[PDB]
Amino acid sequence: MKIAVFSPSESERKLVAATEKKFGCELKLIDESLSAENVDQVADCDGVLLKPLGNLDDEIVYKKLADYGIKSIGLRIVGTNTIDFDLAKKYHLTVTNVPVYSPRAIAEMAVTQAMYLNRKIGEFKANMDKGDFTNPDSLISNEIYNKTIGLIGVGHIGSAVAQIFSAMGAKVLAYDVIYNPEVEPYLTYADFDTVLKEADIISLHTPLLKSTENMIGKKQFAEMKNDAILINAARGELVDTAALIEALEKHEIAAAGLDTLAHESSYFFKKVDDAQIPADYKKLAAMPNVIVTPHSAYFTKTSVRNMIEISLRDTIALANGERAHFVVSR
Amino acid sequence: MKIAVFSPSESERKLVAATEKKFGCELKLIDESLSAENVDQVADCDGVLLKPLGNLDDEIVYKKLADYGIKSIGLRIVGTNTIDFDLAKKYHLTVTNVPVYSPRAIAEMAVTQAMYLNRKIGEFKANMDKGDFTNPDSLISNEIYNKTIGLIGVGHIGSAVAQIFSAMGAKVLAYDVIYNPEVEPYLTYADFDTVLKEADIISLHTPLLKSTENMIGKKQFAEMKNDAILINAARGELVDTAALIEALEKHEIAAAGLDTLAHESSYFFKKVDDAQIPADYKKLAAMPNVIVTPHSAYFTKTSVRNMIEISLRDTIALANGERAHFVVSR
Amino acid sequence: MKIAVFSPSESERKLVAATEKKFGCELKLIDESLSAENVDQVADCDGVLLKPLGNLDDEIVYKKLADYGIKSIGLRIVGTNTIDFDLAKKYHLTVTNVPVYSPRAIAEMAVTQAMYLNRKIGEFKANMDKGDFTNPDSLISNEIYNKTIGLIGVGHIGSAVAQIFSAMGAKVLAYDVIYNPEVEPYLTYADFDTVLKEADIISLHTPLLKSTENMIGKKQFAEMKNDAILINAARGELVDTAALIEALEKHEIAAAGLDTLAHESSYFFKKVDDAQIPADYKKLAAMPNVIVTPHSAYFTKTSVRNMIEISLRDTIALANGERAHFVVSR
Amino acid sequence: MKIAVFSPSESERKLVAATEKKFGCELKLIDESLSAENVDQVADCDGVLLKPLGNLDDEIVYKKLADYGIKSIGLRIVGTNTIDFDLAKKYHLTVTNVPVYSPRAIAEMAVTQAMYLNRKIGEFKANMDKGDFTNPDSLISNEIYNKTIGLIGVGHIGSAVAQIFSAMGAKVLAYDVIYNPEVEPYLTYADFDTVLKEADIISLHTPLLKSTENMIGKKQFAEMKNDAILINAARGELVDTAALIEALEKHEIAAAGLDTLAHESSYFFKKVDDAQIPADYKKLAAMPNVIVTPHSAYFTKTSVRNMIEISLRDTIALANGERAHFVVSR
Ligand SMILES: NC(=O)c1ccc[n+]([C@@H]2O[C@H](COP(=O)([O-])OP(=O)(O)OC[C@H]3O[C@@H](n4cnc5c(N)ncnc54)[C@H](O)[C@@H]3O)[C@@H](O)[C@H]2O)c1
Ligand SMILES: NC(=O)c1ccc[n+]([C@@H]2O[C@H](COP(=O)([O-])OP(=O)(O)OC[C@H]3O[C@@H](n4cnc5c(N)ncnc54)[C@H](O)[C@@H]3O)[C@@H](O)[C@H]2O)c1
Ligand SMILES: NC(=O)c1ccc[n+]([C@@H]2O[C@H](COP(=O)([O-])OP(=O)(O)OC[C@H]3O[C@@H](n4cnc5c(N)ncnc54)[C@H](O)[C@@H]3O)[C@@H](O)[C@H]2O)c1
Ligand SMILES: NC(=O)c1ccc[n+]([C@@H]2O[C@H](COP(=O)([O-])OP(=O)(O)OC[C@H]3O[C@@H](n4cnc5c(N)ncnc54)[C@H](O)[C@@H]3O)[C@@H](O)[C@H]2O)c1
Secondary structure: OEEEEEOOOHHHHOOHHHHHHHHOOEEEEEOOOOOOOOHHHOOOOOEEEEOOOOOEOOHHHHHHHHHOOOOEEEEOOOOOOOEOHHHHHHOOOEEEOOOOOOHHHHHHHHHHHHHHHHHOHHHHHHHHHOOEOOOOHHHOEOOHHHOEEEEEOOHHHHHHHHHHHHHOOOEEEEEOOOOOHHHOOOOEEOOHHHHHHHOOEEEEOOOOOOOOOOOEOHHHHHHOOOOOEEEEOOOHHHEOHHHHHHHHHOOOOOEEEEOOOOOOOOOOOOEOOHHHOOHHHHHHHOOOOEEEOOOOOOOEHHHHHHHHHHHHHHHHHHHHOOOOOOEOOO | OEEEEEOOOHHHHHHHHHHHHHHOOEEEEEOOOOOOOOHHHHOOOOEEEEOOOOOOOOOHHHHHHHHOOOOEEEEOOOOOOOOOHHHHHHOOOEEEOOOOOOHHHHHHHHHHHHHHHHOOHHHHHHHHHOOEOOOOHHHOEOOHHHOEEEEEOOHHHHHHHHHHHHHOOOEEEEEOOOOOHHHOOOOEEOOHHHHHHHOOEEEEOOOOOOOOOOOEOHHHHHHOOOOOEEEEOOOHHHEOHHHHHHHHHOOOOOEEEEOOOOOHHHOOOOEOOHHHOOHHHHHHHOOOOEEEOOOOOOOEHHHHHHHHHHHHHHHHHHHHOOOOOOEOOO | OEEEEEOOOHHHHOOHHHHHHHHOOEEEEEOOOOOOOOHHHOOOOOEEEEOOOOOEOOHHHHHHHHHOOOOEEEEOOOOOOOEOHHHHHHOOOEEEOOOOOOHHHHHHHHHHHHHHHHHOHHHHHHHHHOOEOOOOHHHOEOOHHHOEEEEEOOHHHHHHHHHHHHHOOOEEEEEOOOOOHHHOOOOEEOOHHHHHHHOOEEEEOOOOOOOOOOOEOHHHHHHOOOOOEEEEOOOHHHEOHHHHHHHHHOOOOOEEEEOOOOOOOOOOOOEOOHHHOOHHHHHHHOOOOEEEOOOOOOOEHHHHHHHHHHHHHHHHHHHHOOOOOOEOOO | OEEEEEOOOHHHHHHHHHHHHHHOOEEEEEOOOOOOOOHHHHOOOOEEEEOOOOOOOOOHHHHHHHHOOOOEEEEOOOOOOOOOHHHHHHOOOEEEOOOOOOHHHHHHHHHHHHHHHHOOHHHHHHHHHOOEOOOOHHHOEOOHHHOEEEEEOOHHHHHHHHHHHHHOOOEEEEEOOOOOHHHOOOOEEOOHHHHHHHOOEEEEOOOOOOOOOOOEOHHHHHHOOOOOEEEEOOOHHHEOHHHHHHHHHOOOOOEEEEOOOOOHHHOOOOEOOHHHOOHHHHHHHOOOOEEEOOOOOOOEHHHHHHHHHHHHHHHHHHHHOOOOOOEOOO
16 A cells, blocks of 8 residues: 655665565655654555654644554664653554664674774774884784684674674673573673673673663773773663773773764764764774774665565554564553 | 794794794794895704895805705795795705795685775765764665675685685685685685676685786776775785776775785885875775775784794704605795 | 472483572472372472473362462473463463473484485495495485575574574575564575475474465475475474375485474384384385484483473572563463 | 596496586596506597506506507596506606595585484484384483584595584584694694593594504593594594494494495495405494495585596696696605
């Protein structure tokens, strides 16, 4: 039928025809995200796909959706915080989401950042920018199969990181609160401290909770090997940025790959002026042994494709009164 | 026994003591390369270990080796272009080398640079510098298991690139003029032209011969995919640098990672002033979709140790009358 | 505390001390499974672990459990059919289970059987038993990386089979009703018929439903490649045994590995006399190109360990009024 | 051109036509091995392709080759023990061979037999025959990623066994007298004795020399784990068959898979009567924890094709004056 798609990305636009054909449906793209202003635009539609910028706070929207026969909120993301479930239940609109879009995409960004820093390519470049094309011992590297990898958390994504590294021959240790037999071939569970002590490469794969805010701080960097490489492609708030920067400057660790940062929402996904970018980012950005990507581990064709198709699939099912995989409503 | 060592790296120095214990021999360390000037320091030595800066022109050195009972010359490296094998023969100096110190060192540089450029991490950084923290579609990436790898030449190193990439799920194609059943679990043989046409990532592993100089030029960039990544951790002269720069500038290929570059001799392995760095490097280094490392793919602990411990071991054998594994002709 | 363990296996007995220590609890093993007769034995216990032979039909058991403070039925299996949930809810006894004990154990049995039949070791043995130590062409094999694998269903177990085979270099196709991004690196989804047509090795990984009873029958064997190898380490009822036997005898397929068979419960896990074993089994047993194991893909140390520990873990939690992973009760 | 072929296998016959087209040459097929009796059939031939049953004793054959312009002798196999290299030299017959036709053929036999015996599939069958369909603890297995593999010798084949096993998650240890950096991602080097002590699965990949005959005897079985699996797809004479049988009978090791056996010449590759089969084979074949295959680890399509297409290719080159890759000394 006709499904409204709000807040389409440049990348989602490229998929529309394929998607229309595959699902035998029409997509109606609207350039802003859904809000009391432009809800009058789903009148001609049977369902709705959202990428909310900011909260759906008012109920004039939640009502007018019900009026037009819409029975679902189809989210093209994992995050649900913009969705007032108070109102959702009230108007009988269920909510679907997209939790798993591509674990390998994030995983591969993690491994990639780790590789580059291990090989010290940025430091070399910094050396070269100043005229130094030597091979000093300080920039000596090592084969990845001589490395121990430490995962904090596993999940779909950590599971994938281990698969990859273990496939290159590295030894992989993980701390976790749940035991999962699936990953045993690829890693060995150990506890938190042995993992911080013995890892050459550490990568974060922990959900953000009040209990894990700042779980990597000054104490942990000191416990880490001085030539270790931290990677955080999980949640910025897991790491104490200042403790990081300091650990970096005092050489208590060797490098870092960050696809997330605390207080990122202020500048990530945005165009901005110098005066708008925070100073901690600028510090990390100026370091040849640091990578920062703007939270784009996810950003592959498959992630983008799946974000559309999984959300559409569920949303159509609930337009037919059929059953949808990824509810979050009862 | 005592084996002399010429012109070690500062990281070669770091292993010395460990090597002495592990072999149970002494290592008379001389900073500068062997010459008529320092040849007499070998008097009290059994065998010799060589890293020649330059051609070994003088003959009075080859005589004096054989007058000191030196029965072989142990290249720590793979090159031979300074050994006058004619003089070696008269003085009955058998000549060993190290051809295989760490294929995976180099394979991993090549993989590492491919993944970084695939994830377009430097293009993201180039944006972030100008205030842009978005995810435009021009920087969308892909999972490695959706890419095709094309190898020109295989060899020890290429074989290793194929193992790793195919272990991450990629299709690996390879062109070679010699068949090796060993590598078929990891790749599929194809014609040169089909490799260029079909490969998303192309990595060169072809020796520099007279018939392979500028093997990749204008014609061949023309034949590649326009989102292709070209990796050269082999020999700079395999690639026509102007053809490459033009191809990059015109977006006829997507990225390149080069550990080696035509005309590098003049500045690789040196400290130099802006004026001494060529203009073709300055262009490449300015491109956020390019990586240049200073021929450091080899540079791991493992390599540095093997450069020493493999030469030593054939040098001690030949001194004891035994078999060396890496004797060399012409 | 003290947890009763009913119907302990010989293998579970070997784990008890380790388990007691790890969980800081006492295990009380009872040789029969739980029944109205011996329920008076959990009086001294705080929870209960079951391996039911046959249905828990009567409620004298379900009551007397409640009387003694027991708040859970802790199953050391996946199957719940013996559990009268009518009565469970009635006595406020929740039910836990063990769905995932070791996917790799089943997966590895599958791969193993497949390998052996591909290499034709049994046919060779049959040849040898008669005095033939030749290498006839009919018993020529091939490298596994020249093979295409077909999975019907994926799941945890199929996912694992693909990982392994793909790691050996084989091409892996799967049909499935759900899309799972996790397995894309290891297989390629295709539809049912292409998979039956193009696979050299096919393995079943489909749950038993009325819709999948006999889904492999005469029609399918005919569609399969004549030199293909079917493996069923899923559910016996998925395959039409007579259609199988016939396909085997007419050489419409080449071999089969079966850890399950229709009407197995009559003899599996049992000691029996010749007159007690069915004729279809005896036929398949007499074929050198057939393996039948008595439903023991699961049977490793890890499966057995996990079956105990996962069921104990949950069961203790519910003894404390804490939360248990694997409920099946509401 | 025309190349004669002597004593092809019936599976060698099957490839002939395909080979002719792929090379664009003829293949004059002669059933029996080259002799003074059939040497004259080569008159109209360019080069020759050899599978000698026996010693090439006569000299008048070597003369007549060189009178027919035959410049080389192309062994399709790896053996040389029937080539009188002395006579080859006078007649200027350069002598090629095939040492590397398919390392993975054999590696995969070795892996296949290890997994079958680890899963104890034959011990289960031995039980099922006697009416027992249970899962006693004496037949419990384990996941491959919990086992340690020990390789005595590496080589092309051993290297392949290490790749596969380490790709399934196992720890691989190897003893060798030569260092190869290439294999370090897949295994870790150790002493001979620590390999025997620590390995759950042991696979031999050591050439039969005078110094390796009965390399595995009573002493060494004594040193192995008592649930160890010994795999010999190398050369029978590496193992003391009586020591092995005694070790099995006494349960000093857990299983063995042998593709090769001391004194096999007398019955491997033949059809024979009970009376002609030795008693040490009869014992082994009776053990459900043993596998004997008739030296067929090599036997894949790929091998058979390479035995022909690698010899052909060096034989055509040498006939055209070009370089052969597998010329042989002594
Ligand atoms: N940068 C990105 O592009 C991006 C995108 C999506 C998700 N993420 C983040 O990456 C993480 C990994 O994703 P996933 O799908 O593999 O995870 P998941 O959410 O599927 O599973 C989380 C896992 O973390 C572990 N864990 C739970 N509590 C923990 C604790 N207190 N301490 C340590 N470990 C704990 C458990 O193993 C659990 O299974 C997510 O939690 C999310 O925060 C990042
Ligand atoms: N960047 C570094 O740090 C570094 C250091 C040392 C060596 N290298 C280079 O890495 C490269 C890969 O090494 P390798 O072990 O594969 O080399 P190798 O010498 O072991 O074999 C190279 C392969 O190239 C193939 N080849 C030959 N002629 C060819 C042609 N005309 N076209 C295509 N292929 C051809 C050969 O079959 C051979 O198998 C080599 O060129 C080596 O010089 C790089
Ligand atoms: N022999 C043994 O030792 C043993 C032990 C446990 C389970 N099993 C069997 O093996 C199977 C695989 O286990 P698992 O944990 O990987 O699976 P699972 O139960 O976790 O998942 C089942 C999967 O099968 C697929 N599927 C569902 N319906 C289908 C249909 N109609 N046609 C084709 N495919 C469909 C889906 O991908 C689904 O995810 C189980 O379903 C079970 O029957 C065997
Ligand atoms: N069963 C079959 O079908 C079949 C067919 C052909 C060959 N093979 C055999 O398979 C075996 C493995 O082949 P490969 O390619 O590894 O052989 P290879 O000749 O390539 O190398 C064998 C390795 O054994 C090592 N070695 C040498 N002396 C040793 C000693 N004293 N102790 C321990 N190790 C030592 C060497 O370092 C060498 O690396 C060989 O013995 C070969 O004869 C079997």
